[PDB]
Design an enzyme around this catalytic site. Sequence first.
Site, mmCIF file in Angstrom:
data_model
loop_
_atom_site.group_PDB
_atom_site.id
_atom_site.type_symbol
_atom_site.label_atom_id
_atom_site.label_comp_id
_atom_site.label_asym_id
_atom_site.label_seq_id
_atom_site.Cartn_x
_atom_site.Cartn_y
_atom_site.Cartn_z
ATOM 1 N N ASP A 1 -0.298 -4.155 10.085
ATOM 2 C CA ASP A 1 -1.329 -3.280 9.526
ATOM 3 C C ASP A 1 -2.555 -4.159 9.283
ATOM 4 O O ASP A 1 -2.498 -5.084 8.469
ATOM 5 C CB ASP A 1 -0.824 -2.621 8.262
ATOM 6 C CG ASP A 1 -1.822 -1.669 7.630
ATOM 7 O OD1 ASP A 1 -3.004 -1.708 8.005
ATOM 8 O OD2 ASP A 1 -1.434 -0.873 6.751
ATOM 9 N N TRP B 1 0.848 -1.208 0.000
ATOM 10 C CA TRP B 1 0.000 0.000 0.000
ATOM 11 C C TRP B 1 0.872 1.242 0.000
ATOM 12 O O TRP B 1 1.719 1.410 0.886
ATOM 13 C CB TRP B 1 -0.903 -0.051 1.215
ATOM 14 C CG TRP B 1 -1.891 1.053 1.409
ATOM 15 C CD1 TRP B 1 -2.934 1.407 0.599
ATOM 16 C CD2 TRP B 1 -1.931 1.968 2.519
ATOM 17 N NE1 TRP B 1 -3.613 2.482 1.131
ATOM 18 C CE2 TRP B 1 -3.021 2.841 2.308
ATOM 19 C CE3 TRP B 1 -1.143 2.115 3.662
ATOM 20 C CZ2 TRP B 1 -3.350 3.856 3.195
ATOM 21 C CZ3 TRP B 1 -1.475 3.123 4.542
ATOM 22 C CH2 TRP B 1 -2.558 3.970 4.307
ATOM 23 N N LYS C 1 -13.134 -0.233 6.288
ATOM 24 C CA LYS C 1 -13.658 -1.188 5.338
ATOM 25 C C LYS C 1 -14.601 -2.149 6.072
ATOM 26 O O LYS C 1 -15.600 -2.515 5.423
ATOM 27 C CB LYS C 1 -12.532 -1.912 4.547
ATOM 28 C CG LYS C 1 -11.708 -0.925 3.700
ATOM 29 C CD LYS C 1 -10.268 -0.789 4.210
ATOM 30 C CE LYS C 1 -9.320 0.230 3.440
ATOM 31 N NZ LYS C 1 -7.874 0.250 3.743
#
Lengths: 391, 414
Positions: free
Chosen positions: A203, A121, A239
């Site tokens: 993460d 990312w 999300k």
Amino acid sequence: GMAPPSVFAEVPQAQLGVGAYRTDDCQPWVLPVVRKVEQRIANNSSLNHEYLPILGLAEFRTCASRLALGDDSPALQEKRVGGVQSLGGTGALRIGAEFLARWYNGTNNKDTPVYVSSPTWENHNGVFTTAGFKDIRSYRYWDTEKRGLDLQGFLSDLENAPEFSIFVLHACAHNPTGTDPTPEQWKQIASVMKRRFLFPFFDSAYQGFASGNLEKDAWAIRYFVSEGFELFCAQSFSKNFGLYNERVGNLTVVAKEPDSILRVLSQMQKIVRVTWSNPPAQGARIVARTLSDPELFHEWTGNVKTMADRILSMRSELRARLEALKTPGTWNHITDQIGMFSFTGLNPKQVEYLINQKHIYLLPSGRINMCGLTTKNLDYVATSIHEAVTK
Amino acid sequence: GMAPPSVFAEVPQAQPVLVFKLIADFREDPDPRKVNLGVGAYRTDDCQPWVLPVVRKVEQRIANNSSLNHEYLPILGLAEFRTCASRLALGDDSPALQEKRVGGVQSLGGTGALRIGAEFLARWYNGTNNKDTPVYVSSPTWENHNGVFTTAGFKDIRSYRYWDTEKRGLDLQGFLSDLENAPEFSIFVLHACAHNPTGTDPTPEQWKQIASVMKRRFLFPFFDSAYQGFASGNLEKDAWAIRYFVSEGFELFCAQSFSKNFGLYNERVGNLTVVAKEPDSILRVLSQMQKIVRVTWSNPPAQGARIVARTLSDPELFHEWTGNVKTMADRILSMRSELRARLEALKTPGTWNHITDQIGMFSFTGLNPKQVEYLINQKHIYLLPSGRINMCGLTTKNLDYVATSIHEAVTKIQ
């Protein structure tokens, strides 16, 4: 005629692609349980808007950490866990990075290498660079040719990493490739890390989202905790709660003893205070309420499974149309890949066909979001892809 | 055998902030007469937090719109919020808005707006990555100004004279001298109105003198605007100094907080307003702002900004908000006027008109730290060692007790 020059005169100008969940209808989706709790909040006349504590809403912080670690976690029993409510997963990464740059491996040591996956990312580099880290390294991860995880490459990069190096790890649903290590591969990774004192910075932006099950998707984190690591875990609820724009995140900290947690959190406070001062309440309140109530929690889990199953469905139907179209290459990676994102295996050229020849829009990387596929287009993209892989 | 040590083993315990200790003690106080003048937010006459009626009305509206989704906002924030916020500070008729040389960045309260503007300045102002530019803050100032500029990387933080303990007022001559002696391009953090923590503001005439030296020496105004409307009840008058600088042709930053004037403390609603000499520079400046936000909070939250944007763009709700704002300002003016009147009735030594000359919820009373200790220890009246009080800790019911107690502190402790 004369006149003063602007103090901004020389400021330079900075220089299937959807990035969030969508229904088969192609719309954004407010989870049902979220709509329910928002209504409860709006009609609770007894809530006010006074500042939250600098570290955030207590109940949220406790609930968020328990979600990643599990109710039965030893570290929670032993009180060596802390949480910092943050501005999404980005804010959690940033606060953790700022902490490590000041107090990890020495004081103000900006020389500790930080390793990110290749690829990863993109904001990972940006956050750690901004926190002051000079030496950002990447570890091997995606095998372009086998279209899968390069385990030998990763382990070797682990073996050659200086002691105390920081590794940013994706807990599950690797972004952007969708490729995760299996539990046995995770054990090998943990193995080297423990040996070389490598610090795990997890993460976790897709817990539950990725397999449909929250317990499963948090396994790697829990495994590291059970193996006695100290670790940071940046959690995003953007999300798995669909609360993208309320910026709800949590930084979970696991230490060897409870005393350290108090001291670490005290320094965290200082860093938060000069960044956003204290965090916003609306999203946290929704998450805390949902997680604290067994019936809301049960509904939520059902909502997350719904999203996860729709992605699994585009995944099994895409590899299948492709396969059945006798399209050149192996495509079991499309089903072996987990989460919203998939590295297709196309080359930049092939992508040109896609955007230029048949109007399929995806990144140069070959990254697509499975949530942009629908029952109505599944068919069509499948042949445009069988198309490109061919011309 | 041996278990190797925590990587956190050497992290020190940070030292606490006095005000928290002060709040704690207050609650741990059983005396029914106790008074908390150390609070940092608005309070009603029965000492409660107050959710503005217009905010509760708009929250319900938002809850009942099905059209709203939670998709990410643009990195720089809700467009309608950014425009409305900037127009509120600058005025609809501002020459800068008409000439399109204004930009807005939604931020996490006024603190986030200050942080993003400090980060920009440390990278692109007065050269490139120039961290040596002196940054000047008032003496005294809001405790977080220093930390925010320090963390953005500035190494040379200085103070300008401001509060005069003898005059119990503004030291204009010292301020003016510090301006005159400041290196060109130095950055000045200025309170737009309702100076925190002293409540002492320059008059318009005094602002004109300040502006003339900043103009001459190319000193950069970074306005901190946390109390617009709240201050005076009058939104226009409370933006006067900002607008005056714009009219005089200054380029500037203005860090806006909606925590106090909308009472939305915990929804963290801020705006960084940018005023430039040319329209094209705003595009480039905001492009750099985007990169800084991206690695800090990525994009801002929606709820508080949705509320403010709806209130400011709707004539009926705007009129209602101005009434709510006036209510708060009027309570504060009344406590000020009631306290001074009581102190003077009691023939309390010294002058007390700074109590009504000051503006906003905070007041530097002039009490010394020995007189402060007396009030806490003997009187159960809690305030900071600086003598700072929040006027909102005062109510119709404890006013006599407080006035009387201050009179005691002043006369028995010298």
